[PDB]
A paper describes a structure:
Here we present four in situ and one isolated cryoEM structures of the trimeric spike of the cytoplasmic polyhedrosis virus, a member of the non-enveloped Reoviridae family and a virus historically used as a model in the discoveries of RNA transcription and capping. CPV has two functionally essential components located along the icosahedral 5-fold axis: the RNA-dependent RNA polymerase (RdRp) inside and the RNA capping turret outside;25,27 a trimeric spike is attached to the latter. Each spike monomer has four domains: N-terminal, body, claw, and C-terminal.
In the closed spike, the tip of the claw domain that contains the membrane fusion loops points toward the capsid direction, with the RGD-containing CTD visible, though covered; in the opened spike, the claw domain rotates ~96° and points away from the capsid, while the CTD becomes likely flexible, as it becomes invisible in our structure. The root of the trimeric spike plugs into the iris of the pentameric turret like a bottle cork. The final part of the monomer, the CTD, is a helix-turn-helix. Within the trimeric spike of CPV, it is sandwiched by the body sub-domain 2 of the same subunit and the claw domain of the adjacent subunit through complementary surface charge. However, the RGD motif of the CPV trimeric spike is covered in the putative penetration-inactive state (i.e., closed spike) and exposed in the putative penetration-active state (i.e., opened spike), while the integrin-binding motifs known in other viruses are always exposed. In our structures of the CPV trimeric spike, we observed the PPPDE core in the body sub-domain 2, though its active site is buried inside the trimeric spike. Additionally, we extracted free spikes already detached from the virions, visible in the background of the SA-CPV micrographs. The reconstruction result shows that the majority of these particles are in closed spike conformation, indicating that the conformational change of the trimeric spike was not caused by spike detachment from the virion.
Numbering used by the authors: 26 to 1239
The structure:
Amino acid sequence: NISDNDENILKTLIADYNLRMRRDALLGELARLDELRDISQVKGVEYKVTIPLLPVISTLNQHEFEITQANIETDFIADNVTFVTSFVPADLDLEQTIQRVFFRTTATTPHFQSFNLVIEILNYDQDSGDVELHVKIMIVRPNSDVVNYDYTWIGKDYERISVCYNLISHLQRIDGPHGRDDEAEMPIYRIIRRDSGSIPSYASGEHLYVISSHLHVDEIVRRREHKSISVDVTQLSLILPIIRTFNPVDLREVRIEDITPGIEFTINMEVSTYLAESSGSHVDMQRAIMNHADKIVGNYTGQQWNVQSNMLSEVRTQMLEEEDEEARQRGDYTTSTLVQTMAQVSDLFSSTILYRRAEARLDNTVGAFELLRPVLSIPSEYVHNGRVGPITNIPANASIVTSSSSGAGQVRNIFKPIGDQTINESHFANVFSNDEYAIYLRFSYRQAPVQSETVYLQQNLPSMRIVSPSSVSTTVSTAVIGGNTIHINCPIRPHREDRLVSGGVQVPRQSTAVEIRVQEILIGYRQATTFPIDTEGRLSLELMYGLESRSAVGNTMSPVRFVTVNDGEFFGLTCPIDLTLSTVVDPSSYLSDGVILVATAFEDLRGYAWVATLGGDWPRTYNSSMRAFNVLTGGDINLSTEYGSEMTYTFKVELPIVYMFNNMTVISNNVPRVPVLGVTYASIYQDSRTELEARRFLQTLVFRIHGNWSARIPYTPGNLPTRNTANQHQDIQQVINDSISQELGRLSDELLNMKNRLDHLERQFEMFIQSQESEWWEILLNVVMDTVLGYFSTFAGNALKSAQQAISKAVGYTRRVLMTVTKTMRNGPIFTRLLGAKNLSGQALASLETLVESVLRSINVKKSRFMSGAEPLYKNNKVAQHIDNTEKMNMMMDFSFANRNNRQNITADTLSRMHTQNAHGTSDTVLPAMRVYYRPLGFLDKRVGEALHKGITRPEALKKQLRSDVANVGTRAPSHAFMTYTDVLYEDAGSYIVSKRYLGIGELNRFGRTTSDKNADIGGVNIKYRVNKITADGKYIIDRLSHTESGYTAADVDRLYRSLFGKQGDGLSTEQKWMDISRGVDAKIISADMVSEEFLSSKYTGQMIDELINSPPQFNYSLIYRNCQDFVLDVLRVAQGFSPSNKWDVSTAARMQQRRVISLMDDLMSESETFARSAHSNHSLLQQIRRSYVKARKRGDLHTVKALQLRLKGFFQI
């Protein structure tokens, strides 16, 4: 059978196996089986090629969710928002008392009020992690109905459980049109979310389910053969959005109250970029909800496949290196120091100060300033002997007993404030603001209580008092001689069996000493840097508060420098006025009405009571006070008694002033006074008061100002801007934007003519080309000419790459192109302030200039021939917005703000709140976002850890920690990356076509040598919309186009659906497949990460991307890239105007360049019908020319090539 040498070989193979077993046992308990780990990895790859790319979902943790809620100030509603509670039992902190997730909403919703989840660990063997869990979910409905769900699970330490709660809000109906917006030539529709006379617009539902898994690692190790993981989804509740109701779920109103450390919690939302109407069909709604659920479940399953692979044997991962914060900080700090040195140099220039004439007339204006507290005074030591009073509401029914039989006791109340009531303050009252100047009134305020008599009005219907019990005391035993032993049991609000916790006190009033003394009124100019001169004018001031009033006139004004508390220092002129208003004679004249309450109601005081017994064996005095009351309110609540035949029950409350004034109401609004001099109500006086009228009467100071002034206002010196940049910039982006703003003034205003601008840009491009050492431009021109005439070259991609490298190396040319674009567009400075902390990228602008110039030099025509028409030019020329950066910027700004940017003298601060995008925050980009998204879905990227236990450690804890480490390290990679590119087209007065391009790629294989049906692949689509409609709040409403209008056939739709959802849509028509594809792309990327760049999109870069989307290359991504994010980063780089990757094959970039040039040439030939013909530019004649050219090029015939190039050039002459 075998020889002796073969037997020796067998023995050494056995010995090697034994050495492997020895090593494995040295390392610990975890398995090390390489073949089973490899089979697991291959099967996981096979599953992962099926995880859907769509829909687009954004994942946030708690911190990023809170920052996002703070960022968005308009309506914030998501079609699907899933709250996933995910945990691994080996990651839970077992020293915690409870494992809980609790979150709620502060508003009314059709289905949701609060969500509570508790995890109970019934058994947990930590040596071999065998856990038995019980999960209890509690949902409280808005009508206070409680719904309970249970889930039990027996499994392993390292397996994951996810509880997913989806809140669904579908916009099903828009009502209108209710008019026509005139700035944006669109009809106006409304979107009803709140209770009104209109039909509601939204329908709401919910979806609750649990995901569990079993990774049969123990069985696989015992039997030594692989077994696929098994994932179970349990459906707990599904409510479809069938009927339309008011109050959809707004995410700004959702609170996450408590999550036990160790539990993972994410928010997974899909929010539309613009508002759109959903389908009312039931099957369509259900597919919409289940696509969201299926993507979440697919990502869960991929993660669990990773966990099984990692448990079966050793898997090593290098974690991607994070960018160096500290090196970037040193570079930025050097740049900032250079700017400071430039400012020091510019400080050497001095010039004569030049002024300008300033005149202004202040019409009759009204302003109201509210003091910190209402003007009141609480007397000390206020005693009230009634049964009902400030503190007590004890009915006569209530049983109150004394030592004598049937002897009712008398109750009294004592109230005492704690602390000072005098206040000294100086304020800068706001008067009027303007982009030129701002007016402030400066005064000082005095208050103190004056010796007088208290005034106390008691309500016929008193509010729920703090001490309002059913009974106060009862008799337990009666003695013939000694007296009756009494037991007192007096609870305080709230009672143990109660709803809507409440309680309070009524406060006695007094009279105080008011002293308002106005010193002067000040005005400052924004751009003044030194004292103005020739200051003259007159101002009149009228004070009025309560019942008194004053008036004075100021004549002399002087140049002044003053500092406000929010805006900095101002330079201007002051108008001293010396008047005093003093209502010490009548400070207390609200006497008709005038009940004052203070609310003291707390969850922590429920069930508290005074419990004591008095009598023979018991002491004859009682003196007790609640200390929880002191903890919550820095005061006291007390009850004192003396045992005797006649007993008095003293209920004393003793509050501090600060707590009192932070908690009070001014009911008895029945007799509200009027502003003392018949002034119109100032929106802080009975303007939708809702019981706020007496506090405004007692707190608000209102004044009336009229006058005029004149002065000479200095101009800013010319050497100031660099000092300003050094003195107040925060980032390097601010330095760049400041340089742009200052350079806008250096450029000539002759550039505001189209011919001059085109000549300037041609001269810039000639400078750029003349400075090239290598001759890449001539070969590029040859490539472009061949492409136009039909001969497609393999190194068009090389030509494109050389052009992009030349552009990125010549940053001066890019800077000049950007500067002329910013100068020649409408409202350039407004735009530079709109940018904020971001910079516009000029690489794409110069890229477009180079492409257009290349084609035009090929056909031997100037650009001015294609730029003819009336203004605005992009509305009268169908190619101008595609070949010109200035017209593109104009069109994009008109689109982004619905022509609100064209209002006269509108500031960038006002315009910034008029964007037309849905759920748009000010931290978002003005132009459409264009970036790569790469984050996990349904779980965090790291685990929440623990601190090391302080005690002595034991082996099963070490084993549990190792299991947690292996379950968590390297398994939380995202399953895909993607990128979006969107371009906007103007077609008619109120019609736009928005073209969104999606490109995504799945996670790369561990084993990439397999065939392409089992490798990671890319999936992309181009989707179009039409903008015709707007809301009354200024936001666009979208209609989505069909697949035919996007260029797709039925077979194309089948291929796209397979790429984007990972399956053949079975039982779906092409209409349903396109509905799913189109609806899955309109979601918006929500993140707390901030971008610092703006990018302008172009139609021909979009064609370059469509070249990848429509005819993808035969590429093995798994073998070439380390990461699926790197591919989409390469594509995004190409989209941003940079060169193609050297990882790609040659023909990829070749085809991209051919597509962009062919698209531009078609556009130019279509436009040339105005100055050429269509009979001699027919498609049939051009096809013959192209076929002849290809044949002539393939056989080296220069005569025919030249003749055909002349024929093509002559197409554009006559």
